[PDB]
Design a protein around this ligand. Structure first.
Ligand SMILES: Cc1cn([C@H]2C[C@H](N=[N+]=[N-])[C@@H](CO)O2)c(=O)[nH]c1=O
Ligand SMILES: CCCCCCCCCCCCCC(=O)O
Ligand SMILES: CCCCCCCCCCCCCC(=O)O
Ligand SMILES: CCCCCCCCCCCCCC(=O)O
Ligand SMILES: CCCCCCCCCCCCCC(=O)O
Ligand SMILES: CCCCCCCCCCCCCC(=O)O
Ligand SMILES: CCCCCCCCCCCCCC(=O)O
Ligand SMILES: O=C(O)c1ccccc1O
Ligand SMILES: O=C(O)c1ccccc1O
Length: 582
């Protein structure tokens, strides 16, 4: 196009254009104030319309990266606020832009964003809506500089609905809060998920990623031919590779381009794309990536014709090991949407191992006639972890269930930070909440998604603050080994029980007047220091105590005179349990 800006403005819309320019500049100039940024958006939007009016207007033919950089090099305090980043302005565009990508801060030092009161929030949102969103949109961006922009916009649009609906309600907070937490968590997960995909692209390699996508894709579009999926795995790989490079616009077009190919090849890909394809440039990619799996053929043979029996298995496999193995994954995944992607790589890594062995045999066929046999236990184990856990969760409530997990893990690795356990057990604990709601069909996949972040997130904390060679192994190991590795952890025997401290176990009436969360976070934080002091406790010697506490509260919060009750009663509880747990 004669004018990069004229185009992006025209098919995004003025509204979407400004939100996107804001986030863009908010991720770079993270230290400037809101008024300052609003400055740019308006300076830029005014310039843009210039270009829409005349594609040949002054400076409209300049590239975005160029225009973007110029504006970046426009800030007066650039050199004294961003220091090095300012040295980027002394470079020619191709490098400049590249220098600006490197001089960005992943984790800045801004304070945590504090959720105001539903009243002041709803008020503010009402008074000056636009600013209310753009500002906090500004606030999210500057804290998550790498978070893909458009997606951040989708959360914005959502957050906006959260208010539109709830602020005009009766028991507002009862409507908004259990939406903000959902939107928060949800965005914290989206942030961790794209941060990992890239972490995966470097440590593990191009091949490994490709393996991943052939599976998730044929699992998604199971009616595509192998060649059609390969095309996509290839186009997709480019995408993540560039997007993981940082450049937003480069990343954006790769995504746009690909979605164009997919929409002009629906008949060749899925039938579930009518909708998504019918949307405007902004939604397509997003929409598609979220579309449901198409239904499979139904007649579909059995993977035994081409991978076990049939002559020339080794002949085919040896000609192009990967294309072959890819064809295994393809054929295997498409007949199993119910499978966790990583479980499919496990099966395939097996089959692989097998051929490298059996195709170097006297009578091959005989050597691997027993291969699909080795798949049942690999499949079973993860399936049976779900049963057991969801069964357990149908039994106890989410909370009562998050405490089983708490004790479970506190005994697995007592060394880990107490606050880290509560959090893990909680986040981990939720997972069963919104996965065990799905029937078998969607479960296992479900878990792999959430469990993947909850685990990486856990590794990172352990990365920065190592604490157990064991979680380092599980965290250092391969993706296919990660999750199972963790389920392998056994109760720690070498552990030496944390010596006692009544302060850690002493409770004041303030608990009576605490927000449920706080109350739970508080019961659980102790339940842990409890397992950490008296680890050799039976869920028997342990289900107790927890009960003498259940009413220990009812006995001091209902009381006319708390304060002291939480002292005289307290001494009695601690004492009763000092002995109970010999
Ligand atoms: C997994 C995932 C990726 N993405 C984006 C972010 C990634 N770039 N970065 N950073 C990009 C990789 O193709 O897709 C997304 O918007 N939502 C998601 O759930
Ligand atoms: C891109 C997101 C735009 C969302 C705008 C946020 C307005 C909501 C107020 C903050 C709510 C969550 C803050 C928090 O949970 O700490
Ligand atoms: C300084 C000017 C900045 C302009 C930024 C324009 C960003 C346009 C993003 C379009 C993203 C489409 C994403 C998609 O289709 O998945
Ligand atoms: C587009 C080419 C398709 C290639 C498919 C390659 C599949 C081979 C990977 C086998 C699984 C073990 C490799 C890994 O560690 O992820
Ligand atoms: C273990 C100290 C950190 C706590 C988490 C360790 C185990 C997390 C693995 C979760 C995977 C399976 C879920 C489960 O089996 O309960
Ligand atoms: C709150 C209870 C949550 C329990 C969820 C456990 C689900 C286990 C998922 C196992 C995934 C295995 C992945 C793999 O083997 O590659
Ligand atoms: C040394 C003995 C200390 C006694 C402290 C017990 C710890 C109690 C944790 C309570 C968990 C209960 C959850 C609930 O009450 O619903
Ligand atoms: O912190 C949030 O509330 C949030 C929301 C959406 C996306 C990323 C986020 O951090
Ligand atoms: O971004 C896409 O275009 C996409 C397409 C298919 C599957 C996952 C995806 O993220």
């Amino acid at each position: 196009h004669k004018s990069e800006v004229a185009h992006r403005f025209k098919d995004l819309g003025e509204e979407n254009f400004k939100a996107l320019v804001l986030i863009a500049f908010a991720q770079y100039l993270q230290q400037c104030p809101f008024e300052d940024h609003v400055k740019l958006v308006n300076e830029v939007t005014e310039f843009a319309k210039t270009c829409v009016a005349d594609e040949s207007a002054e400076n409209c033919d300049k590239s975005l990266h160029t225009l973007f950089g110029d504006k970046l090099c426009t800030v007066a305090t650039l050199r004294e606020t961003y220091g090095e980043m300012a040295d980027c302005c002394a470079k020619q565009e191709p490098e400049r832009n590249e220098c600006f990508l490197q001089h960005k801060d992943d984790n800045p030092n801004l304070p945590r964003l504090v959720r105001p009161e539903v009243d002041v929030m709803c008020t503010a949102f009402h008074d000056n809506e636009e600013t209310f969103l753009k500002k906090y949109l500004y606030e999210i961006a500057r804290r998550h500089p790498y978070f893909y922009a458009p997606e951040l916009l989708f959360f914005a649009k959502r957050y906006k609905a959260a208010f539109t609906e709830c602020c005009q309600a009766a028991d507002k907070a009862a409507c908004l809060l259990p939406k903000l937490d959902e939107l928060r968590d949800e965005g914290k997960a989206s942030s961790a998920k794209q941060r990992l995909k890239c972490a995966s692209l470097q440590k593990f390699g191009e091949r490994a990623f490709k393996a991943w996508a052939v599976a998730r894709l044929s699992q998604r579009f199971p009616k595509a031919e192998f060649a059609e999926v390969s095309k996509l795995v290839t186009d997709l790989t480019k995408v993540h590779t560039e997007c993981c490079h940082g450049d937003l616009l480069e990343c954006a077009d790769d995504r746009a381009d690909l979605a164009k190919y997919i929409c002009e090849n629906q008949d060749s890909i899925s039938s579930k794309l009518k909708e998504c394809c019918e949307k405007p440039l902004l939604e397509k990619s997003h929409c598609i990536a979220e579309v449901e799996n198409d239904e499979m053929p139904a007649d579909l043979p059995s993977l035994a014709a081409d991978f076990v029996e049939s002559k020339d298995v080794c002949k085919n496999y040896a000609e192009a090991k990967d294309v072959f193995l890819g064809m295994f994954l393809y054929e295997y995944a498409r007949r199993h949407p119910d499978y966790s992607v990583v479980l499919l790589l496990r099966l395939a890594k097996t089959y692989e191992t097998t051929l490298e062995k059996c195709c170097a045999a006297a009578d091959p066929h005989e050597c691997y006639a027993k291969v699909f046999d080795e798949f049942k236990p690999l499949v079973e184990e993860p399936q049976n972890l779900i049963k057991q856990n969801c069964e357990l969760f149908e039994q106890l409530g989410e909370y009562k269930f998050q405490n089983a997990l708490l004790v479970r893990y506190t005994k697995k690795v007592p060394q880990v930070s107490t606050p880290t356990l509560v959090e893990v057990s909680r986040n981990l604990g939720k997972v069963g909440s919104k996965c065990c709601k799905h029937p078998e069909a969607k479960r296992m996949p479900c878990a792999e998604d959430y469990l993947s972040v909850v685990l990486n997130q856990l590794c990172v904390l352990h990365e920065k603050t190592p604490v157990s060679d064991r979680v380092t192994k599980c965290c250092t190991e391969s993706l296919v080994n990660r999750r199972p590795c963790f389920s392998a952890l056994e109760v720690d025997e070498t552990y030496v029980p944390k010596e006692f401290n009544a302060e850690t176990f002493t409770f004041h009436a303030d608990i009576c007047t605490l927000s449920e969360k706080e109350r739970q976070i508080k019961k659980q934080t102790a339940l842990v220091e409890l397992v950490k002091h008296k680890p050799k406790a039976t869920k028997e010697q342990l289900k107790a105590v927890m009960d003498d506490f259940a009413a220990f509260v009812e006995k001091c919060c209902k009381a006319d005179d708390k304060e002291t009750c939480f002292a005289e009663e307290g001494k009695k509880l601690v004492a009763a349990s000092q002995a109970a747990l010999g």
